[PDB]
Design a protein around this ligand. Structure first.
Ligand SMILES: CC(C)CN(C[C@@H](O)[C@H](Cc1ccccc1)NC(=O)O[C@H]1CO[C@H]2OCC[C@H]21)S(=O)(=O)c1ccc(N)cc1
Lengths: 99, 99
């Protein structure tokens, strides 16, 4: 699709089988979600933003689906105020920023 | 321009006359710049990012130019780990996400 930015670019994604409202976020290097439970081993990571840092769990090889597209990649899970799909996933599906 | 997302979408912008590299950040409502001095009056404000609130100075009616495009808007000056252009500016210059 071709999504303009007059409002927040929010879409419904299925991540690990769960429906989550997500922001398509070119400022996010990696996908970060708050409200999800993913199974198995994870690695401890941290992310940095405006106001400070968030500790996150990194889950690898997760199925991410939205807007008819499908990708597999890592998901950082933690107390973020916004659920974002970042460039780790958007690059994989050929998403570009255009004007 | 067509900007891929396999790397950070960083462009050179002129913001109130000042040349600065900035991140095109679709997940930011607002344009937040740390590395800038802007003249004139400003409004004290607090904005929340991923780690909570930070104090910024809001400058209004700033001319922002990048990649053969121009828009006028507000700039928040304050601490951020990346100088970001938000939707306040990107929506005015017809920026779209495409995939
Ligand atoms: C500041 C960016 C370099 C990084 N952020 C992505 C960014 O798009 C966040 C995404 C975001 C969105 C809402 C709340 C927190 C974070 N937006 C943001 O901080 O915007 C602020 C300026 O405009 C305002 O509008 C929204 C918050 C304010 S981030 O959330 O900290 C972030 C950092 C790393 C990862 N992997 C994922 C996300």
């Amino acid at each position: 699709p071709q999504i303009s930015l007059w409002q927040r670019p929010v879409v419904t994604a299925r991540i690990g089988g769960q429906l989550i409202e997500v922001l398509l976020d070119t400022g996010a290097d990696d996908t970060v979600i708050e409200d999800i439970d993913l199974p198995g081993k994870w690695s401890p990571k941290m992310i940095a933003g405006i106001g400070g840092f968030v500790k996150v769990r990194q889950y690898d090889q997760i199925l991410i689906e939205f807007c008819g597209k499908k990708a597999i990649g890592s998901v950082l899970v933690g107390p973020t105020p916004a659920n974002v799909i970042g460039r780790n996933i958007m690059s994989q599906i050929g998403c570009t920023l255009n004007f």
